[PDB]
Amino acid sequence: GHTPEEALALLKRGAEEIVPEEELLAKLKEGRPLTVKLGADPTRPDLHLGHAVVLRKMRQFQELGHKVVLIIGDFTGMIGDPSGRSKTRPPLTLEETRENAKTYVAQAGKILRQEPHLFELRYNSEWLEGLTFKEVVRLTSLMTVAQMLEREDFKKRYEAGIPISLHELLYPFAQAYDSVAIRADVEMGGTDQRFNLLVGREVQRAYGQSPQVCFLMPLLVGLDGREKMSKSLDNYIGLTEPPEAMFKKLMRVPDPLLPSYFRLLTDLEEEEIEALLKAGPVPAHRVLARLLTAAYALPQIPPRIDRAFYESLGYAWEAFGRDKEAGPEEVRRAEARYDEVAKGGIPEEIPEVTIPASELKEGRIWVARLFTLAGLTPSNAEARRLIQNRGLRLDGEVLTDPMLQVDLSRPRILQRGKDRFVRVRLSD
Amino acid sequence: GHTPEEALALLKRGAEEIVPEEELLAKLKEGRPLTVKLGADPTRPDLHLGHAVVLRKMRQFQELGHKVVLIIGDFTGMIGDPSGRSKTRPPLTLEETRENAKTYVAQAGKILRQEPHLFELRYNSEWLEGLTFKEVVRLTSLMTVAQMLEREDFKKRYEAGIPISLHELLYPFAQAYDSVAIRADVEMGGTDQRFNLLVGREVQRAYGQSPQVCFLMPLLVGLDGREKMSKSLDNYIGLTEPPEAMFKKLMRVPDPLLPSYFRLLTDLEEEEIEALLKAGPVPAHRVLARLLTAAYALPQIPPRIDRAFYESLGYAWEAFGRDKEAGPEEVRRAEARYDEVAKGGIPEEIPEVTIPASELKEGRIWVARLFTLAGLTPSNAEARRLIQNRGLRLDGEVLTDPMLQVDLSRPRILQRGKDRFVRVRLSD
RNA sequence: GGGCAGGUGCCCGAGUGGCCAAAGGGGACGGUCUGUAAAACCGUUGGCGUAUGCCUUCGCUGGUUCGAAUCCAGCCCUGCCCACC
RNA sequence: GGGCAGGUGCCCGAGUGGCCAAAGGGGACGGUCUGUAAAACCGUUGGCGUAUGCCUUCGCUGGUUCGAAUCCAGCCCUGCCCACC
Ligand SMILES: Nc1ncnc2c1ncn2[C@@H]1O[C@H](COP(=O)(O)O)[C@@H](O)[C@H]1O
Ligand SMILES: Nc1ncnc2c1ncn2[C@@H]1O[C@H](COP(=O)(O)O)[C@@H](O)[C@H]1O
Ligand SMILES: N[C@@H](Cc1ccc(O)cc1)C(=O)O
Ligand SMILES: N[C@@H](Cc1ccc(O)cc1)C(=O)O
Ligand SMILES: [Mg+2]
Ligand SMILES: [Mg+2]
Incomplete structure (x- = not known):
């Protein structure tokens, strides 16, 4: 077990900022599982190692006995977090986010403990859909125009004449209300989330809650x-x-x-x-x-x-x-495989593509069109350009004839660039 | 009866702006009663002759056969229209506005026809209370930050460092949604309402409605x-x-x-x-x-x-x-009465105030305290100051002794300034 | 609601009737060299199976012209400026 | 979340330990003159029944001082600047 001081020192490792840091220490002395919030808008499928930065820190909280609440922003993702944006985000449908959401739920468990006492999944549509106009008025009354425009992307866009849609200024209040809804002790984020996390503190104060610790990781x-x-x-x-x-x-x-x-x-x-x-x-x-x-x-x-x-x-x-x-x-x-390919070798396991004989012309296939059929080039013109730049190989030899007509009477190994391979063969 | 051209010419009289004027002409040729909107936030009781400017024009519409929809802003009045404001408006309770609303309904009929085919009363809480967060997001997405800040009071306050509460930027969308809710053909207002009326047009377009004519009267x-x-x-x-x-x-x-x-x-x-x-x-x-x-x-x-x-x-x-x-x-x-008072006379009908004898001191009342008891002065100090400036009269004579002790053995006529009168007498 | 400017390639952004699949910068892609890295250097950055060619291409829809990314008109959206004060 | 400045009378706003119920401008109020108007001019613009006095007073709560609107501290709210990029 760890003391609160030992806990804080461990949690600080790798972090960019814990704010207020003294408040995290005080929460850690309460001797209870803290509610550690992370939201993620599934605007595209799949998690990456950048997400792993914040999720691994959450795993550390769980290994110390604290409880993660992972909020799928199915509602917020319909809007679009403008944080860091150079221009307004495109909207998505609730069905769009919930299809992408399936990957997030499945993949989050590759890092997060999944035991209920350590983990709970929520969808913020659960409470945001029922928020009423009167409540939205009262939420937005908590901040002024000048305060909102301090956020770097708002300030830069406004001063440059780049449009800011007014609904972008509502997004932070949705994220912040989420913290009220789940009574967050801590909200996680990359440094890009700093402003919205601080709005979370302001909204929690207005709802009579202890304001969350904002836990920021580097990107x-x-x-x-x-x-x-x-x-x-x-x-x-x-x-x-x-x-x-x-x-x-x-x-x-x-x-x-x-x-x-x-x-x-x-x-x-x-x-x-x-x-x-x-x-x-x-x-x-x-x-x-x-x-x-x-x-x-x-x-x-x-x-x-x-x-x-x-x-x-x-x-x-x-x-x-x-x-x-x-x-x-x-x-x-x-x-x-990495080393074999580096030295110019061809790996034994390489994707296979069968080409129907209906593609043949004079019993062969022009090399450029063959690479497009194999999925290695987006167009024959691009295949030709890659040949001019010596970017394509056939059975290990660099192609120099962009007009080559390839014989497919036996399987041929196509290569684009350093390590994209496809073996092609024929079928009626 | 009037032709559409005759109708428009009559309606133009006294107006500051009809916009788009050609659209009002086209609506007037449709041969149907037009829906003519006026909202009024009952933030204080009672209508005045300024309100009469817009209401009389609405009466003209009714006399031409068109239908007024008078919207009591019981919901909007809780917020506060920032139009023309030098600072943020104080909020009110829904009960506050509905008490003031009673005077508006009673007094509006002093100008407006009240027959149902010419007049309908609505309370915008009827539909604004049920507006959902998703709908508010979609409404506010119709305008940008730079567009909103063009409104003169927003521009001047922002450039001067005077706070603008973010909820003030939601108010125009409530007023504009009201036009969608009642399918307004025309929205009335004083010139101070120009921006919100134009937002009405934008929101109606987004809901697939013909955008209202904005009808602006001088203040x-x-x-x-x-x-x-x-x-x-x-x-x-x-x-x-x-x-x-x-x-x-x-x-x-x-x-x-x-x-x-x-x-x-x-x-x-x-x-x-x-x-x-x-x-x-x-x-x-x-x-x-x-x-x-x-x-x-x-x-x-x-x-x-x-x-x-x-x-x-x-x-x-x-x-x-x-x-x-x-x-x-x-x-x-x-x-x-006006002429009698102008020539220094006292009218025969003047308010009466009975003073209880418990107020007497040495069988009299100091003149300063007497005027405060009569309701004519807010304080004895102010009564004394008015005497020094020769602003008070007793039975028609200008008071020059601020220490005078007044005999109330018979009724006395008190006068403050030019035409505020009170007759005082005693009662145990 | 009124005016003016603007929307162009992966991004920013120039164009300033033909020289435009389009300046310049960034990015991405291929290669040399290697360490499947960086840097530097060279090249590429609409499509099309016979190419001195065909198709599509600068917000949308049309128009003038032998020819429009460029000029005109209506429309959509944005910025600035009006209006509102 | 960090810093700095700020909140004062009907409004704006000055104060720069005492000279403060408080500069200046606006407004409002009284009066002259009248037209129950304007302008101009003079005055007023915390309260208190014996006043050389008492009570309250500059965002809230406290503190230093003989004395705080002024200086200090905590807190609330705002503006500007950070942070975020
Ligand atoms: N590259 C990254 N490094 C660290 N954190 C990240 C990264 N990308 C996303 N995150 C965090 O993951 C959450 C979701 O971000 P996003 O995927 O951008 O919606 C936010 O808290 C981000 O700050
Ligand atoms: N003095 C005035 N002259 C003309 N119209 C007015 C005046 N005062 C208010 N109105 C109009 O009455 C409606 C309600 O205004 P308000 O009473 O200011 O909320 C708005 O359409 C105003 O423009
Ligand atoms: N704003 C976060 C997502 C998020 C959603 C809801 C929250 O409560 C918190 C965060 C992002 O850009 O991914
Ligand atoms: N904004 C108007 C009131 C109003 C309310 C609702 C409306 O739909 C229209 C106008 C005012 O200041 O009084
Ligand atoms: Mg405009
Ligand atoms: Mg701050």
């Missing part, structure tokens, strides 16, 4: 190296991606992001992180990719993604990435 | 000569004030307001108004005061407050105010 940067990991930016690693693909993507995280990936996605000690960085960028990537590929290949990540877990998998810490043959089978194969 | 200036007549400014003449008081107040309208009072409150022709102004300010006041004192002494004003009506009362147009002995008894007495 994981995406694979591009600059922007926050997000679905819209197509720079993300999904929690349910096959180990093969997760391992490859983690190996390609830009080197300057390694410390934050270790701090936000693992529990390694600071000296352990420095030790991996001493070994060098590639060894450090191998350990990161092994830890997380293994953890997310499990049905649920362990309570600690630490050195002990690493060795649990069969790896040796003092090998610093050299022991490639160790580990869970799924991870070992993923790393083996 | 009647109050007795102070500068500000719009309003209860808050204490510069108004109430529709139900006794003829005695209405006549006196109309005689004291500043001379530069006479043309607008004739144009907005009577139907006299422009050449008739000039003819009265030629007679001089006082004659012109006598005719104005007679016309309106008579009209509002009736249970309902006539369809035309014109020269024919004037002569109907027994006055002679070519006497230009000299025939003081003519007219309804109530008006003749009011004018007689």
Whole structure:
């Protein structure tokens, strides 16, 4: 067990801000399970490692005995959180969010404990649909226009002449009322959620509730190296991606992001992180990719993604990435495939596509149209352009003839770029 | 009967703006009773001649066969229309507005026809209370922040650092939704209502309705000569004030307001108004005061407050105010009292106040405390100050001794200023 | 409700009758080099099976012109400015 | 959530330890003059029945001081600036 001070110190690790920090300490001394809120608007399906930053911290709360309330923003997602936005969000239907919501519920359990005393799922439509005009008037009366416009995206858009739809100013009051509805002790979020979390405190005060602690985590940067990991930016690693693909993507995280990936996605000690960085960028990537590929290949990540877990998998810490043959089978194969492809090899397991003979012309298929039929190129023009840039291979050889007519009398291995492969064959 | 063109020309008289004017002409050619909307938030009891400006125009619509829908803003009045406001309005309870609402319903009929085919009363709580959060989101999505802040009071307050409560930006959508609820063809208002009326058009378009014509009347200036007549400014003449008081107040309208009072409150022709102004300010006041004192002494004003009506009362147009002995008894007495008081006389009918002998000190009452007991002064200090300024009279003589101890062995006539009188006497 | 400007490619954004699948910057994509990284460098960034060609393309719908992303008109939406004060 | 400034009389607003029931402007109120108007001019704009006095008074609650509208602290609310990007 932990004392309240020990609890707070553990929870602080990796956090950007706990505010008011003294209030979390005081709540931790109450000797009761705290209600820890996280909302997520399912505007697109699937969770990624950026979501894992806040969810892993919530798992830490659960391992300390506190209760997570995961709010599916089926109602709020219809609106669109303008936080950080450069322009107004497109609306979605309640049915749209609830289809995406199914993935969130299924995937959240890959990180969160699911025992009821530690976890409860809510849909904010449960209470937001019945909120009446009079109540909305009284809620919005709690803040002024000048106060609302302080939020960075409102200030910048207004000063630049970029439209702000008035309904965007109602969204924070929905999120904040959610905290009243579930009597939140703590609200989790990335740093981008800071303003809405603070409105939560204001609305709770107005409803006579203790104002929640706002618990802010730093944002994981995406694979591009600059922007926050997000679905819209197509720079993300999904929690349910096959180990093969997760391992490859983690190996390609830009080197300057390694410390934050270790701090936000693992529990390694600071000296352990420095030790991996001493070994060098590639060894450090191998350990990161092994830890997380293994953890997310499990049905649920362990309570600690630490050195002990690493060795649990069969790896040796003092090998610093050299022991490639160790580990869970799924991870070992993923790393083996990564290295085989890196050296110019073709993996043995590659997707298969059968081409109907009705596509043949003079008994063959023009190479450009063949790659579009295989799903590797969006258009024949693009296939031609990739050939001009030496981006396509046929049975391992770089294509130099954009007019090549390909013989499919036997299966052929098509390759686009570094590691997209398809074997094509014919069928009547 | 009137043609649509004749109808529009009549309705234009006195109006500041009909917009789109061509749309009113087209509605008038439809050959059906148009729904003519007026909302009024009963934030204080009683209607005044400023309200009469818009209500008389509505009466004109009714006399042309169109249907008034008078909306009591029992719900909106709880919020507070920020239009023209220098600061945020104080909220009221639904019970508060509905007590004030009783006066509005009773007094509106002094101007409006009350036959159902010409008149229907609604309370906007009828439909606004059931408006749901989702619907409010969709309503507010119809306008942006920059669009909302164009309204003069929002722009000036925001640029000056004067707070605007966010709920003030919801009010126009309530007023506008009211137009959807009753399918308004026309919305009436003073010029101060222009922005909210135009939002009405936008919301009607979004609900697939023909957008209402916005019918704007100029604001009647109050007795102070500068500000719009309003209860808050204490510069108004109430529709139900006794003829005695209405006549006196109309005689004291500043001379530069006479043309607008004739144009907005009577139907006299422009050449008739000039003819009265030629007679001089006082004659012109006598005719104005007679016309309106008579009209509002009736249970309902006539369809035309014109020269024919004037002569109907027994006055002679070519006497230009000299025939003081003519007219309804109530008006003749009011004018007689006005002139008697002007020449320093005391009227025969004056309020009576009985003072209990328990107020006596050495068998008398200090003059200052006597005026406070009579209701003429708010405090003895103020009575003393008024004596120093020669503002109080006792039995017609100007009081010069602020220490006077008044003998009440017989009734005494107290006077404050020009025309506030009270007769005081004793009782055990 | 009135005026003016604007909406363009993955994003921002230039166009300023033809030189436009479209400047410049960013991004993304391919390659060299490697470490399936970065940087640097070169290239690509509507579609079409015979191409000196065909189809589609700058908010929507039309119009003038041999030719419109560009000019005109109606309409939608936005910003600024009016109106309201 | 952090900082700074602010809330004063009917309104705006000055105060800058005592000279404060409180500058200045507006408004309102009384009077002269009249037209029960305006303008101009003079005056008034916390309360109290013996006044060289008593009571209350500058967002709320306390505090320092002989004395606080003024200085200090906690709290409420606002504006600007942070945070968020
Ligand atoms: N890349 C990220 N790093 C850390 N937290 C994130 C990231 N992306 C989303 N979140 C958090 O996950 C929640 C849902 O975010 P979103 O998916 O953007 O609606 C919010 O609390 C976010 O701050
Ligand atoms: N002095 C006035 N002159 C003309 N119309 C007025 C006046 N006062 C109020 N109204 C109109 O009466 C309606 C209610 O106004 P209010 O009493 O200010 O809530 C609105 O349409 C106003 O424009
Ligand atoms: N605003 C959060 C979602 C959310 C929804 C409801 C809440 O109560 C809290 C958060 C997001 O952008 O994903
Ligand atoms: N806004 C109007 C009242 C009103 C209420 C409802 C309406 O639908 C229209 C007008 C006022 O200030 O008095
Ligand atoms: Mg406009
Ligand atoms: Mg703040």
